[PDB]
Amino acid sequence: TSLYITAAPIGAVPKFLDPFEATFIPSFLLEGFFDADRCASIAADLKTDGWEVVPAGGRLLQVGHAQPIAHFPKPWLAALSNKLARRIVLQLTTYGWIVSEQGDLLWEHERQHHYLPPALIEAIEKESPALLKNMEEAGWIACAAGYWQAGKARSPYLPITPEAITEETIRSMRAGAAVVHLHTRDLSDRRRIEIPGLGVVTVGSQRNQIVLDDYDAIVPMVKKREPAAILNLSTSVRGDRHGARSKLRRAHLKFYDDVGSAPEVASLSPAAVVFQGGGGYDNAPDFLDAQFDHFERVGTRPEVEVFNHAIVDNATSLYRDRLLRTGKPVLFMLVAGVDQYRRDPITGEVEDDSLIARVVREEISSLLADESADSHRRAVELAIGQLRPVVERLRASFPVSKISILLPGPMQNLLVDVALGLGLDGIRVGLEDGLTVNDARVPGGVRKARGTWEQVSLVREELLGRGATILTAAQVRDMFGLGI
């Protein structure tokens, strides 16, 4: 098959981390400078924003970062188990350190306030006391108890503003992506917390939210630079119950006068999406009737986000004629590897409804953890066996269709094999789905991606190495009849 790459640069879940902000707040400074109650308040707000309580024993590397009241050579990391090295590499690249061509970690800035937690330091101390000593000579200093910003599910490169989203969209397209799937985030709750003997920390939910003013900016800013761009707007209200039938979910799917069209594509999920991990959202029949009516009217092609088997059942039965009406080829995205529930409306009980059955998915994760060529091949087999009948049901009901696949970060080594073996038409990558890339230069072999564009370049590379063709935006538009 020929394939198109979808870039997904933002999503609902990951958060931006400012790597130039403090990453550790000592207890004695917070508790002993504010009243015990506003100290409980600041703490709660830090905790809301993902900061975690830590005991003494951490290490802090700090330069030019306080007011009155930086390399990691490859042989250092190579001295450790793969697991320990990966932990360090992921933590430091989350903090904006980068991997050099020699496979060293480098911080390429003057100031920094970068902290490693006691559990990491303890593990280093056990595997290599000499490394801990080398680190302390390099300036890593022992810490008291306090609060740490791990940046769990965070990236210093996540774009959350119209300007940054535009720039990443364009870079992703230039790295090879034909389609860009967009979310916006609500940043109205941003607030600066000042801490004496430390400085300012900025908190905020970065909550997933359709922001109309953001799209009013993004759509023409993208189109001015790349008029061929195929924009796929998220209609999801993930994280935000109580908005599931709101017209807000199509208000961004208007004709944009500055651009002379409605968005080319937008996401549509024709059943409730109930993540096993929590945070899902309904898509009721009355709401969906309104969505389809609207997509058809403005000329936006739905991309059916196939989260679960309920969606497969519904798309191929009740909603089939409506999907045909919104134009061929009908577009599908397999949200593979993400555990899903279906809830019985009568009893309220849930059962597995994942595309890859959770029990099978758990086996796949175990196999990928082996890091052996045999295990990888078994993992691919299990994935294909689970996904094959889903793909065939979709192909049978929609002879003129295009089916892509995504996978969560930790399963992404399967992406190309699974997509090629299923005869899929596309593959999606981006910070929405995973924050990492492989990098053979660095011990442990994994690090934070420099951007969605980097993930796009790498998947494009792997595809070309197996004799696949990569379609451009101009080609996808023409062949899928989009933007009319």
Q: Which helix (H) or strand (E) holds 47?
A: helix 38-48
- Residue 209 found at the interface with ligand OAA (CB under 6 A): no
The tokens describing 377, both together, are: 């091949």
Asked whether position 182 contacts ligand OAA by CB under 6 A, the answer is no
Q: Compare residues 73 and 408 and give the one whose CB is closer to Mg ion.
A: 408
What's CA 140's distance to the chain center, in Å?
Answer: 31
Phi (first) and psi of residue 416, to 5 degrees: -70, -45
Q: How many residues bind ligand OAA (CB under 6 A)?
A: 9
Residue span binding ligand OAA (CB under 6 A) among the ranges 121-129, 220-228, 235-243, 443-451: 235-243
Integer Cα distance of 396 and 402 in angstroms: 12
235 binds, among Mg ion, ligand OAA, none (CB under 5 to 8 A by kind): ligand OAA
Taking 3-state DSSP, the helix, strand and coil percentages for the chain, each rounded to the nearest 5, stand at: 40, 25, 40
Which residue, 94 or 184, is less far from ligand OAA as judged by CB? Answer: 184
Q: Which residue is nearest to ligand OAA (CB)?
A: 267
Site for ligand OAA in 285-344 (CB under 6 A): 305
Per-residue binding string, ligand OAA, 237-256, x by CB under 6 A, is -x------------------
Rounded-to-integer distance, Cα 330 and Cα 316, Å: 11
Cβ 154 to ligand OAA shortest distance, Å: 17
Site string (185-224) toward Mg ion, x via CB under 5 A: ----------------------------------------
Q: In whole angstroms, give the CA distance from residue 301 to residue 263.
A: 8
Residue 433 within binding range of ligand OAA, rule CB under 6 A:
no
User: Interacting stretch for ligand OAA, rule CB under 6 A, among 32-40, 90-98, 104-112, 228-236?
Assistant: 228-236
Relative to beta strand 146-148, strand 52-54 is: antiparallel
Q: What is the 3-state secondary structure (H, E, C) of 280-303?
A: CECCCHHHHHHHHHHHHHHCCEEE
**Are 352 and 343 spatial neighbours (Cβ–Cβ below 8 Å)?**
no
Q: Is 457 in the site for ligand OAA (CB under 6 A)?
A: no
* C-alpha angle 129-130-135 in degrees, rounded to nearest 5: 100
- Alpha-carbon Rg for the chain in angstroms: 23
Give me the amino acid identity at 166.
T
3-state secondary structure of 32: coil
The single residue among 91, 149, 232, 234 that binds Mg ion, judged by CB under 5 A, is 234
Site for Mg ion in 81-110 (CB under 5 A): none
For the chain, how many helices (H) and strands (E)?
17, 29
Handedness of CA 456, 461, 465, 467 (dihedral sign): positive
Q: Indicate the burial class of 449 (C-beta count within 10 angstroms; 0-12, 13-18, 19 or more).
A: buried
Residue 283 interacting with ligand OAA (CB under 6 A):
no
What residue type is 108 in one-letter code? Answer: E
State whether the Cα torsion 181-419-461-74 is positive or negative.
Answer: positive
Asked if residue 482 lies in contact with residue 402, where contact means CB atoms within 8 angstroms, the answer is no
Residue 305 binds: one of ligand OAA, Mg ion, none (C-beta under 5 to 8 A by kind): ligand OAA
Q: How far is the CB of 323 from ligand OAA (least distance, A)?
A: 15
Establish if 420 lies at the interface with ligand OAA (CB under 6 A): no
Q: Shortest distance, CB of residue 236 to ligand OAA, whole angstroms?
A: 4
Closest CA to 470 of 122, 462, 65: 462
Q: Beta strand 265-268 with 301-306: parallel, antiparallel or unpaired?
A: parallel
Q: Is 151 in the site for ligand OAA (CB under 6 A)?
A: no
Which residue in 93, 149, 166, 236 binds ligand OAA (CB under 6 A)? 236
Q: Does residue 235 interact with ligand OAA by CB under 6 A?
A: yes
Question: Are the CB atoms for 114 and 62 separated by under 8 Å?
Answer: yes
Q: Which residue lies nearer to ligand OAA by CB, 58 or 280?
A: 280
Judged by beta carbon, residue 265 or residue 463, the one nearer ligand OAA is 265
**Residue 8 vs 473, nearer CB to Mg ion:** 8
Dihedrals phi, psi of 193, to nearest 5 degrees: -105, 120
Using the minimum distance from each CB to Mg ion, give the nearer residue, 173 or 180.
Answer: 180
Scanning 231-239, 244-252, 433-441, 460-468 for contacts with ligand OAA by CB under 6 A, the matching segment is 231-239
Q: How far is the CB of 80 from ligand OAA (least distance, A)?
A: 35
* Residue of 51, 198, 55 whose CA lies nearest to 121: 55
| # of chain residues touching Mg ion (CB under 5 A) | 1
Backbone angles phi, psi at 104, to 5 degrees: -85, 155
Residue with Cβ nearer ligand OAA (236 or 452): 236
Q: Which of 3, 5, 7, 12 binds ligand OAA (CB under 6 A)?
A: 12
Give the nearest distance from C-beta 287 to Mg ion in angstroms: 17
Of 75-83, 123-131, 230-238, 446-454, the window that binds ligand OAA (rule: CB under 6 A) is 230-238
Q: Using CB distances below 5 to 8 A depending on partner kind, what does residue 238 bind out of ligand OAA, Mg ion, none? A: ligand OAA
Q: What residue ranges bind Mg ion (CB under 5 A)?
A: 234
Q: What residue ranges bind ligand OAA (CB under 6 A)?
A: 11-12, 234-236, 238, 267, 269, 305
